[PDB]
Amino acid sequence: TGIFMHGKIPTLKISLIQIFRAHLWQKIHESIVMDLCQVFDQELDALEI
RNA sequence: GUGCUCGCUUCGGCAGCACAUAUACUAAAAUUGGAACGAUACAGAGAAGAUUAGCAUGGCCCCUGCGCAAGGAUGACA
């Protein structure tokens, strides 16, 4: 994940590992990329793409 | 090597004499081997109970039925 830990806070590193389990950061990035691709696809005649 | 012997002997030289007394891992070079938790690659919830559904058994208290043993009170003229 893109979380930076400013100090070993063990009671928070675990709660952040739980939240971003199963590669949630990568899936969020992929989902946003795909949603932007779709919106640019629906607008390609007016946008001259 | 320096200096000296009344030495041979000549200043071209020779013989002897005093001092000098035992350094070095010694090494400039020879070669072929075995090698990360450093990177990238993979995984990554990197600390939880490792569960909850029935029925029957076991304990206590009644009720009913059957059996065993030992008994109590009562009833019946022609």
Protein A41 CA to nucleic acid B74 C1', in Å? 110
Instruction: For A16, list phi and psi in degrees, rounded to 5.
Output: -85, -30
> CA A36, A38, A42 angle in degrees (round to 5)?
120
CA distance A1 to A28: 11
Header resolution in angstroms? 3.1
Protein A18 CA to nucleic acid B50 C1', in Å? 19
Protein A4 CA to nucleic acid B56 C1', in Å? 59
Q: Let me know: does A1 contact A20? Beta carbons within 8 Å.
A: yes
Q: Shortest CA distance to A16 belongs to which of A28, A27, A7, A4?
A: A4
Listed in sequence order, the DSSP H helices in A1-49 are: 10-19, 24-42
